[PDB]
DNA sequence: GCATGCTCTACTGCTTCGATATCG
DNA sequence: AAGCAGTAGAGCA
DNA sequence: TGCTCTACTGCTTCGATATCG
DNA sequence: AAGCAGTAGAGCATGC
């Protein structure tokens, strides 16, 4: 199907990005830009050996992604703007640019979704319609991250914002990533 | 049995008066009986085309059979229904066909008795096949053929019981002396009226009983039980177009080849591969690789736990539901476990869940087993046999997505008027009889081509409504319900 | 003691026939 | 294998 | 600026065919 | 799947 995919990788060992001023937007490097996915995208997925972590910030890569969407979108009309976030919510954050950035996503019509680690709240292998907590996995960083993503998502949608978070363990036996894409019938 | 065919001998009485018009000007019984025999052949040549059918007349002037009796004459012999045989049979219509019958063999002689049934027995005997049902249809009007002798009466009532001893069943289709049943006589020895069933109702049907799969159900890993997975509805369609030569009208026997690699010569399946193309790159696999990459299991029914009969809606289905039955052929004693499981699931209204793989290599499919209990009465209404129904289920890319976003309610006045409308249009649905129009038109088209009764009968569209009757049955409230809330109003 | 002669279930396979999947 | 609405590039206001 | 024809074109669907129990 | 025909791996019996 005629689509376009663009991937942002934040927290690598190099800061090459369309906008990066100082320690703001540090260690943000896009892998492959807005492209029809050929096998080179899968080659770049298989060239992902390093975590290579010097993490700076993550609530700014969304601003970079929307700005490269605005820069590239000239005549290429997209009916929707879907942005996924993949993290485990264990590093620290920056609560300054949250209200204005939520207002800009409200005025630019972005559909965002969030993917979560193993611990939402015997052999917990991959997914078996089972539990989520190994014994108890949440610390204060997961507490603050889970509550800010819950409040951001309920202010973005409502009740379904609480439903617009999904765990890695049960998203393999569902297609919750395949929502709000296909033109209906 | 399964390869067991069934037979029918049509015995026709033409002694003295049925060849006559019986002092009437309405309907003659001889042409009536020939109409009924031709109708039975026409129905069964497209309904059940492997059975055995024959015609015999008795009481005629001539005589021809295998043992040379007197006044017994046959016309066809025990075989399949044939177009040549009905085009031979239909010559006896009207008074002109009656006189043609008179010059062909002549009506009127001393009709004998039970040795005609002896000739029917000799027709039933010498056939090298398997026979399931043996019935004799007797077309006659005389209800006392022994007006002068007791010896032929005794030999009739003895030979009929002798044919009953080896299982032969005759059933006379009674004629009428004034037009209705009035000859209330005492055949309470020979036999074990209504001829519209021989006329009308078997224009489209087929005959079979098979099993479609014999599988095993695995409860844990090690406690398995044999079941057979029968079918109940199968969407019957028209027989295939046999290829034929234009001039001589024989089968063609086409043959296929693959060749021409810019060398001429020939090719072979070992010299070729399968491939797919994705933008630029092509991927090359083999036929065995294509066959192998769809594999998940071995064929069977894996148990996966029990479920209450609420969550599965009947809105969810994907295929004509099958019907599983237990049998004591593979594993001895499975009827016990199936009857016990059926009784427990029947009292506690719980359905089973299974993973289902039909044959030796098919990716798996989730099925749900729902039990059902039997019914019968004095008329033997076996409409429900006991056993489990296999409701299919979708997975994720069968339930599509609708636009879903429109909502405006309605005012509480129209619901009672529509209740009145549907209560005026309220009747029983059916038990049967909603026949296929395109298949039925093809059936009648194929009927009127090998007989050259040219006139192609237009098929009765039974599915169509009758708006000229339904307007008056409904009543003059159409425009009332229109201008109530939804006027056209330009 | 190895070589040849009757004989008994019974395993593989041919044939039809109906359903299912696939392609045009 | 074969028909039914979608959508733009000329023919015509 | 405003209207019209039509030139395919995906999205279907019967119908012919290859396989399997 | 249902039916049915066939032959072979083997088992008892006798011999220069």
UniProtKB/Swiss-Prot annotation, chain A:
- Where is the cross-link described as Glycyl lysine isopeptide (Lys-Gly) (interchain with G-Cter in SUMO2)? 136
Q: Give the location in the cell.
A: Nucleus; Nucleus, Nucleolus; Chromosome
UniProt modification remark: ADP-ribosylated by PARP3.
What switches on expression, per the entry, is described as: In osteoblasts, by FGF2.
The UniProt record lists the VWFA domain at: 1-172
Q: Which residues carry this modification: N6-acetyllysine?
A: 95
Residue segments, region Leucine-zipper: 89-116
- Oligomeric and partner information: Heterodimer composed of XRCC5/Ku80 and XRCC6/Ku70; heterodimerization stabilizes XRCC5 protein. Component of the core long-range non-homologous end joining (NHEJ) complex (also named DNA-PK complex) composed of PRKDC, LIG4, XRCC4, XRCC6/Ku70, XRCC5/Ku86 and NHEJ1/XLF. Additional component of the NHEJ complex includes PAXX. Following autophosphorylation, PRKDC dissociates from DNA, leading to formation of the short-range NHEJ complex, composed of LIG4, XRCC4, XRCC6/Ku70, XRCC5/Ku86 and NHEJ1/XLF.
What domain notes does the record hold?
The EEXXXDDL motif is required for the interaction with catalytic subunit PRKDC and its recruitment to sites of DNA damage. The VWFA domain interacts with the KBM (Ku-binding motif) found in a number of DNA repair proteins.
Q: What else is known?
A: Individuals with systemic lupus erythematosus (SLE) and related disorders produce extremely large amounts of autoantibodies to XRCC6 and XRCC5.
What function is annotated for this protein?
Answer: Single-stranded DNA-dependent ATP-dependent helicase that plays a key role in DNA non-homologous end joining (NHEJ) by recruiting DNA-PK to DNA. Required for double-strand break repair and V(D)J recombination. Also has a role in chromosome translocation. The DNA helicase II complex binds preferentially to fork-like ends of double-stranded DNA in a cell cycle-dependent manner. It works in the 3'-5' direction. During NHEJ, the XRCC5-XRRC6 dimer performs the recognition step: it recognizes and binds to the broken ends of the DNA and protects them from further resection.
Q: Which family does it belong to?
A: Belongs to the ku80 family.
The name this protein carries in UniProt is X-ray repair cross-complementing protein 5
Organism of origin: Homo sapiens
The part of the entire sequence present here spans 50 to 244 of 732
Curated annotation (Swiss-Prot), chain B:
> Annotated region DNA-binding: where?
233-297
Covalent link Glycyl lysine isopeptide (Lys-Gly) (interchain with G-Cter in SUMO2), residues: 243, 273
**Modified residue annotations for Phosphothreonine:** 411
Report the locations given in the UniProt record: Nucleus; Chromosome; Cytoplasm
Q: What does the similarity note say?
A: Belongs to the ku70 family.
Q: Beyond the main fields, what else does the record say?
A: Individuals with systemic lupus erythematosus (SLE) and related disorders produce extremely large amounts of autoantibodies to XRCC5 and XRCC6. Existence of a major autoantigenic epitope or epitopes on the C-terminal 190 amino acids of XRCC6 containing the leucine repeat. The majority of autoantibodies to XRCC6 in most sera from patients with SLE seem to be reactive with this region.
Q: What is this protein called?
A: X-ray repair cross-complementing protein 6
Q: Which gene is annotated as encoding this protein in its UniProt record? A: XRCC6
